[PDB]
Amino acid sequence: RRSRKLILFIVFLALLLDNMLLTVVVPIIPSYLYSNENVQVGLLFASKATVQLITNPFIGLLTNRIGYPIPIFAGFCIMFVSTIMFAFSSSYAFLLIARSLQGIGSSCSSVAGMGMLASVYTDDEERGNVMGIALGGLAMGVLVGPPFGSVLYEFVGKTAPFLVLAALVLLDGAIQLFVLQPSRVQPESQKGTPLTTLLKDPYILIAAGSICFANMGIAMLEPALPIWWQLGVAFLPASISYLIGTNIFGILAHKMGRWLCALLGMIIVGVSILCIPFAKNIYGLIAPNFGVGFAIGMVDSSMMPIMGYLVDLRHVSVYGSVYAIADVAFCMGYAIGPSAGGAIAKAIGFPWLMTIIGIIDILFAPLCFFLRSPPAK
């Protein structure tokens, strides 16, 4: 009733449905907008990520205090509510409210799920493979969001995508209730490491910063696009590379040494974003997006297991707070990317900002090298 494969499949389907509900509202954004960079789409991107950043550490403490399954089930009882709220959203305020709920549900699911994955798969290699599979599920969600949403919303109606996603969610929630059975509390054995200590560390800082700055590029590029069939096939070149990269490096990273794969993933992000401006909409902006996605997938699949590795090598073997920190770093892009990046743009323009990002990415790339051999304690 607790085989590792089942929990891995849980986290897979969790991140898949979460990101599908995330990106399925894209064909529904203009239908609430019209009724450079955008401000309203910026707020739609912001609110959820900001609430996720607000709620990640508190979830990382809740899991250590009552267990993982109850957080995961709270996530899957929230997402089912946010989906219905979406399905019954007319104005802008209700849209933002539903997005923030969805954000709390996401934060919950992602943090507690990565924590359970690191807690079950105790060994390394297998944990690398497992994190790769989970991020591949996330990628599959990002891929299957836009086209599914577009086709349904354009075929039968605008409520149907949200309601079908609600049904899929409910099925996922039932599966999870069968596999995990959170009907009883279960606190972890050891007292978790104080978050202040985990944050004072250099190495977790370096890994989290690498994730954050490898995500910031594609986080600032998207909410400022020529859009808002160019809407459904908008985010295909990014996700079709994210998946192919993560579900290949998750299994072939430890053999090379993550430190090398992380450095290469940051370099590739940099060289892709730097070349973004040399493009047009249909012909140009595709291939650089593919490079960006492949590289950020490499970086994510290389840096997600390291977090648990660092904690096992230098702290008490608990996985909640550290993966909450990793998720905070990953999602900080979409909170300070649209608004602050939008202001930087409207001051200087996007053909300049992307270069700046590329510079900071190429500078932060060799800083991963200090993830070669962290001295234990």
The annotation places the binding site for serotonin at 138, 142, 215, 218, 222, 235, 242, 300, 334
Is position 20 an interface residue for ligand EBZ (rule: CB under 6 A)?
no
Give the shortest CB-189-to-ligand EBZ separation in angstroms.
34
- Is 26 a binding residue for ligand EBZ by CB under 6 A? The answer is yes
Torsion of CA 264, 133, 107, 112, to 10 degrees: -120
Q: Interacting stretch for ligand EBZ, rule CB under 6 A, among 41-49, 184-192, 273-281, 321-329? A: 41-49
C-beta of 176 vs 272, nearer to ligand EBZ: 272
Q: Breaks in the chain at C–N > 2.5 Å: after which residues?
A: 35, 228
Residues 306-345 that bind ligand EBZ (CB under 6 A): 334
Return the amino acid letter for 67.
G
Burial of 206 (0-12, 13-18, 19+ CB in 10 A): buried
Determine, following the binding rule CB under 6 A, whether residue 45 of this chain makes contact with ligand EBZ.
Answer: yes
Residue closer to ligand EBZ (CB basis): 29 or 70: 29
CB closer to ligand EBZ, 225 vs 316: 225
Q: Contacting ligand EBZ (CB under 6 A), which of 67, 105, 293, 305? A: 293
Of the candidate spans 32-40, 42-50, 122-130, 165-173, the one that interacts with ligand EBZ by CB under 6 A turns out to be 42-50
Q: Which two tokens stand for residue 139?
A: 């990628």
Give the Cα separation of 117 and 10 in Å (integer).
Answer: 10
| Unique residue bearing structure tokens 């430890």 | 254
Determine the 3-state secondary structure of 297 from DSSP. helix
309: helix, strand or coil: helix
Instruction: Tell me the closest approach of the beta carbon of residue 34 to ligand EBZ, in angstroms.
Output: 17
DSSP string, 189-257: SSPPPPHHHHHH-HHHHHHHHHHHHHHHHHHHHTTSSS---TTTTSSHHHHHHHHHHHHHHHHHSTTT-
Report the residue number, 176 or 215, with the smaller CB distance to ligand EBZ.
215
Q: Are 275 and 288 in contact (CB under 8 A)?
A: yes
Residues binding ligand EBZ: what is the number (CB under 6 A)? 17
349 sits in the region (left: phi over 0; alpha: psi -120 to 50; else beta) called: left
> What span, in angstroms and rounded, lies between the C-alpha atoms of 304 and 302?
6
Name the residue nearer to ligand EBZ (CB basis): 102 or 193: 102
Give the interface segment with ligand EBZ, choosing from 20-28, 149-157, 170-178, 366-374 (CB under 6 A): 20-28
Among 47, 55, 102, 239, binds ligand EBZ (CB under 6 A): 239
CB closer to ligand EBZ out of 118 and 331? 331
The binding site for ligand EBZ (CB under 6 A) comprises 22-23, 25-26, 45, 48-49, 142, 218, 222, 235, 238-239, 242, 293, 296, 334
